[PDB]
Design a protein around this ligand. Structure first.
Ligand SMILES: C[C@@H]1O[C@@H](O)[C@@H](O)[C@H](O)[C@@H]1O
Ligand SMILES: C[C@@H]1O[C@@H](O)[C@@H](O)[C@H](O)[C@@H]1O
Ligand SMILES: C[C@@H]1O[C@@H](O)[C@@H](O)[C@H](O)[C@@H]1O
Ligand SMILES: C[C@@H]1O[C@@H](O)[C@@H](O)[C@H](O)[C@@H]1O
Ligand SMILES: C[C@@H]1O[C@@H](O)[C@@H](O)[C@H](O)[C@@H]1O
Ligand SMILES: C[C@@H]1O[C@H](O)[C@@H](O)[C@H](O)[C@@H]1O
Lengths: 88, 88, 90
């Protein structure tokens, strides 16, 4: 079975749903006007997500794992960047 | 092992915990006064959840997956509060 | 297979907590603005979820750790991590 993770923000709301399927994580997006495919596409067998607002600006962190390696992906308004997270 | 997803809201808080076990997802609930089994019962091998407030009203989305098929389930509302009635 | 994670965050700094189940043990990595560090949480589990809420400026965290058909709730309220009253069934 695929594995999903979800976040949301605001009152509209916006929702982002990440799905790990066959070693790849993809993103479906809701901003009030229908589901669409988001920009996020990265390798992983497992996904988690959290997000927070700074005023009206959304920040998202997606944790993608394959084997024992977890990579953090960051959305801070300009598209996705690798974060500093290490699992240790 | 069973797989869970959790969400919470307010400052009481209210918590909802969803558990996928043997292809069924069930819901346990906390609103300050003990754990109880919720109405949510739907098929799934994997679950995620998110929730947001609009004023006092909570809105919940549960993402239930079996195979490659993810179904979104939706609920919302206002929990129990004392009303204006007086016997005057 | 792959490790399994859960994440929560609060405030605007923000603070982030990332729980990882790896080979039957869940550990915690923490961000409070100044670098990632290993947290106090360390308990058994193959699967993990988490939620948290603020009461004013006080964070409260609940981690749901599952092994087999047993899910244990762990509570962070300022007294270390304690076992909560959650059970999966009546
Ligand atoms: C916030 C939205 O709520 C309903 O409109 C659903 O049909 C959508 O899929 C979304 O969850
Ligand atoms: C907040 C951002 O919203 C859309 O632009 C998506 O395409 C990105 O992947 C991200 O989720
Ligand atoms: C909130 C922080 O944002 C960026 O600085 C990342 O590189 C960190 O790992 C963290 O996610
Ligand atoms: C909120 C707390 O932050 C750090 O003190 C961690 O070591 C604890 O495990 C908890 O996450
Ligand atoms: C919010 C509540 O906090 C404690 O009372 C736990 O024992 C409960 O199970 C619940 O998590
Ligand atoms: C918010 C709602 O609380 C109720 O008591 C539950 O039975 C519903 O399934 C839902 O979680």
């Amino acid at each position: 079975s695929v594995q999903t993770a979800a976040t949301s923000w605001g009152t509209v709301p916006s929702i982002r749903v990440y799905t790990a399927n066959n070693g790849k994580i993809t993103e479906r997006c809701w901003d009030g006007k229908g589901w669409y495919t988001g920009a996020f596409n990265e390798p992983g067998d497992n996904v988690s997500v959290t997000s927070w607002l700074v005023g009206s600006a959304i920040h998202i962190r997606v944790y993608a794992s394959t084997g024992t390696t977890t990579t953090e992906w960051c959305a801070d308004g300009n598209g996705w960047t690798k974060g500093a997270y290490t699992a240790t």
